[PDB]
Amino acid sequence: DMEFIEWYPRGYGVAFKVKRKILEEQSEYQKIEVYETEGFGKLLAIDGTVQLVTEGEKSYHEPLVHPAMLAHPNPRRVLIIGGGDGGAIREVLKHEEVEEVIMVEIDKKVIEISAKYIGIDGGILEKMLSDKHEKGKLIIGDGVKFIEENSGFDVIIVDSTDPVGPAEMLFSEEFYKNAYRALNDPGIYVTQAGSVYLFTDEFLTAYRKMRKVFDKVYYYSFPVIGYASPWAFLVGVKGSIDFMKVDAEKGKKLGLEYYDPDKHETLFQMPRYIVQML
Amino acid sequence: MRDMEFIEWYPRGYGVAFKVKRKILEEQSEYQKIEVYETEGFGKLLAIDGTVQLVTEGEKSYHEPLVHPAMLAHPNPRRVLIIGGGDGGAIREVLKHEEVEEVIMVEIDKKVIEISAKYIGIDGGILEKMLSDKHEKGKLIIGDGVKFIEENSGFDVIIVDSTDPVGPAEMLFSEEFYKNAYRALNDPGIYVTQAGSVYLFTDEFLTAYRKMRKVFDKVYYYSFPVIGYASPWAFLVGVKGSIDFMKVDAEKGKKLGLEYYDPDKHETLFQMPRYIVQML
Ligand SMILES: N=C(N)NCCCCNCCCN
Numbered sequence: 001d002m003e004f005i006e007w008y009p010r011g012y013g014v015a016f017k018v019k020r021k022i023l024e025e026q027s028e029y030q031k032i033e034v035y036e037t038e039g040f041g042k043l044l045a046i047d048g049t050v051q052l053v054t055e056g057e058k059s060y061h062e063p064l065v066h067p068a069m070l071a072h073p074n075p076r077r078v079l080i081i082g083g084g085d086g087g088a089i090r091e092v093l094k095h096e097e098v099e100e101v102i103m104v105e106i107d108k109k110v111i112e113i114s115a116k117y118i119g120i121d122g123g124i125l126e127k128m129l130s131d132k133h134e135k136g137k138l139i140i141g142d143g144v145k146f147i148e149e150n151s152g153f154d155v156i157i158v159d160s161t162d163p164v165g166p167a168e169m170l171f172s173e174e175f176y177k178n179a180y181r182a183l184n185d186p187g188i189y190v191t192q193a194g195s196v197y198l199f200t201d202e203f204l205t206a207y208r209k210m211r212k213v214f215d216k217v218y219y220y221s222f223p224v225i226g227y228a229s230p231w232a233f234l235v236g237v238k239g240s241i242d243f244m245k246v247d248a249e250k251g252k253k254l255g256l257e258y259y260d261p262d263k264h265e266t267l268f269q270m271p272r273y274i275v276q277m278l
Numbered sequence: 279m280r281d282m283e284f285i286e287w288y289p290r291g292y293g294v295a296f297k298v299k300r301k302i303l304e305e306q307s308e309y310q311k312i313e314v315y316e317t318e319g320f321g322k323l324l325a326i327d328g329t330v331q332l333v334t335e336g337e338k339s340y341h342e343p344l345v346h347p348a349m350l351a352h353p354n355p356r357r358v359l360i361i362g363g364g365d366g367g368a369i370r371e372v373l374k375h376e377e378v379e380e381v382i383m384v385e386i387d388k389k390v391i392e393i394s395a396k397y398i399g400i401d402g403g404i405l406e407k408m409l410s411d412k413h414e415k416g417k418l419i420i421g422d423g424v425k426f427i428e429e430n431s432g433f434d435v436i437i438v439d440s441t442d443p444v445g446p447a448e449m450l451f452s453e454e455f456y457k458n459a460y461r462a463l464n465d466p467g468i469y470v471t472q473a474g475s476v477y478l479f480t481d482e483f484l485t486a487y488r489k490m491r492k493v494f495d496k497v498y499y500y501s502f503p504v505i506g507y508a509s510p511w512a513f514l515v516g517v518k519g520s521i522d523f524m525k526v527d528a529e530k531g532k533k534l535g536l537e538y539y540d541p542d543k544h545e546t547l548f549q550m551p552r553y554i555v556q557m558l
Contacts, residue, residue, distance in 0.1 A: 005295055010319030013295030015285060039290025059551070197336075197505065223503070223510045223551070225477060230503040230510065260552040269546035271339070271503070273537045 004035060006049050008198045008228045014050065016043060023117055027109035029163045034117045040225070044085060044118055046110070046161045052085055054120055056225030060192075061087040061159075062259040063222035063233065063267070068155055068190040069095050070246035070261055076100070077184070079153040081143030081169070082160030084110035086121025089136055092157070093124070094254050101136050102153075103128070104143045110161065111138075144168065144175055147182045154184050158191035166194060170206045176213040176236065186239035189214065193232040196221050196271065203232045204277055210236045218243045220267045222259070230269070284315055284323065286330050288478045288508050294330065296323060296506075302397060307389035309446070314397045320506065324365060324398055326390070326441055332365055334400055336505030340472075341367035342539040343502035343547065344439060348470040348515060349375050350526035350541055352435055358382070359433040359462070361423030361450065362440035364390030366401025369416055372437070373404065374534050381416045382430075383408065384423045386446075391418075424449045431462040438471035443482055451486045456493040456516065466519030469494070475508035476501050476554065483512045484557055490516045498523045499558075500547045502539070510549070 005015040016037045023034040033045040041054030052060065065088055069075050078101040080088050092101055105111055115125040128138040139146070143160065156179055158169060169175050169191070179189050193203045203219075210217045214236030224231040235243050244265075251261025260266070285295040296317045303314040315323040321334030332340060345368055349355050358381045360368050369383055385391055395405040408418035419426065423438070436459055443451040450471070459469050469490075474482040483499070491497045494516035504511040515523050524544075531541030540546070 003293075005293075007295075007297070011297030011317065012319070013283070013285070013293070013297070015287075015293030015295050017287070017291030017293070037291065039292065196503065221503075223476065223501075223549070257553045258551045260550070260555060263548065263550075263555075265545045266547075266549040268543065269503075269549050270540070270543075271538045272540040275540060275543075 004037070004043065004045070008195060010198060012198060012228055014226070014228055016040060016053070018043070023113065025109060025113065027107050029107040030161065032109055032113050034113065042118055043226075044114065050226045051161060052087065052120075053226045054118060057085075057087050057120060059223065059225040059258045060227070060231070061091050062256055063220075063224075064088060064159055064190065064192060065091040065157060066251065066254060066256065066259050066261065067220065067243070067246060067264070067267060068157065068188045068235065070248075070251055071241060071243050072154055072188050073186065075154045077153050078102070078155045078157065079147070079182070080104070081146070081156070081158045083157070084161065085114040085118055086111070086125045088157055088159045089124055090121055093135065095250075098135060102139060103136060104139045104141050104146045106140065106142050106163065107161070108140045144172075147175075147178045151182045152184060153182055154187055156183060156187070156189040166202060170202060171209070173209045173213065176210055180213050180236065180238055183238040186241045187237065188241050188243070189236040191234055193219070193234045195228040196230040196232045196274065198228050199232070200274060203234070204274070206234055207278060210234055215239060216241075216243070219270065221269055222267065284317070284325075286325075286328060288475060290478060292478060292508060294506065294508055296320060296333070298323070303393065305389060305393060307387050309387045310441070312389055312393050314393065322398055323506070324394065329442060330506045331441075332367065332398075332400075333506040334398060337367055337400060339503065339505045339538045340507070340511070341371045342536050343500070343513065344368060344470065344472060345371040345437060346531070346534065346536065346539050346541065347500070347523070347526060347544070347547060348435055348437065348468045350531050351521055351523050352468050353466065353521070355434045357433050357464075358435045358437065360384070361426075361436070361438045363437070365394040365398055366391075366405040368437055368439045369404055370401055373415065375530075378415060382419060383416060384419045384421055384426050386420065386422050388420050422446070424455050427455065427458045427462050432464060433462055434464050434467055436463060436467070436469040438469070440471075442474065442479070443486075451482070451489070453489045453493065456490055460493050460516065460518060463518045466517070466521045468518070468521055468523070469516035471514055473499070473512040473514045476510045476512045476551065478508050479512070480554060483514070483554070486514050487558060490514055494518060496523070499550060501549055502547065
């Protein structure tokens, strides 16, 4: 009767009954574990926290990727910071306009373990590790340092494990300034912002820093299976991007299971007390 | 282990856990097991048959969406019926609408009401007054909501805040009952009930949706991140008459000073996983 629990501030806990432990490894950056749960497939755990559960991860990767993609007029060049499990790039590649996607992940072990034991990327990670993927380019490196030197991205998506905590790319206005400069015109930057209820102060702090840097900023939430849902997301745009509208026509073709492009307006649910604190 | 923990396990082996300071109570009533816990960070936790009913710190995330959308969509909710709601959260919210003239609360387990009034106390004195039949608008009745609805009618709004549809409680999600609930409604009138965990009690949701669709003039579904329950939670709405649930009276909503449900962005109240929408 094994049990996996992740505790959050104020003593809230996300728990899963698990069948067996499959793998426990230590990388130069973090502890990586893989469990076979009872009703959610395989769970990827990084330093004791849920990265994803194979039977539910689409509830995270879909709202993280598609909203931004569908709100950009021509998302040809995309940057993903993190995304070691491969889920985000998989969703990104579903968009035909994409010509090139650069993925910068600092921990190679997360990528290899995910490709061999998680397997949600469909072969994208392996094809990328050998540098044989047509559109995807993998760079084992630091995402922050990368956008300091690189530009030309229509869409920037941050999906990181946060090795040194959330602050690295959330409380850094330096970082947001570099991200905005890295975006094409028009461009869109999107990132997960943590738990709506248990990470509220941080969420609000990132929102205000982004507000001064980008041309317009937005927030949204989504019920993510595996996390202390609802989960918050933050968006920052450069130039002509109206995040309140998505090309629903293009959405129908993605075969989404969670995010509903036809009801994009419902993506913005957010407790009133929080909205009032902005 | 170093501390005390409380967990509600749902299907699929998923659990909602709370670190607690200690267990304040456990009373096996005629109908169910009632327990109260002092949590480390969410106030007092009320549980029935092991399922979370509410945490005093965050319960408005349930009672606000359960009550106000329907209340705000109705042109004039003068007479209201609540089935269940022993804790008093629902009636508290209902009484915030000045159009309300009288409310009838039908709860089957009186223990739940007494325990709530003594160890929870989120009802702002309402439960006590009704218990001694002194409330000016609220009237309490200890019985089965399923039977009361067979001989009673004349309600602008009907709020069903029962436990999960598992046992005697199950009948509050049956067609026979929906049919009578429909008949009991004025024209226009609106019915609303909690409908279970969106991701884990999906069948409860889908089953009730179809049953309600067969009975009412129009049916709607919505969800809200309820603190303490598997998140998000589903809600089903049944309408009789011209009421468009997609619209609520925003000006009236302002006077309520809500903390969770936002009537200014009523459209956001309808989030729902695409695959579940596609199963309707
Ligand atoms: N599995 C669960 N936790 N279900 C909770 C909903 C049933 C209690 N409704 C009454 C809530 C208090 N108004």
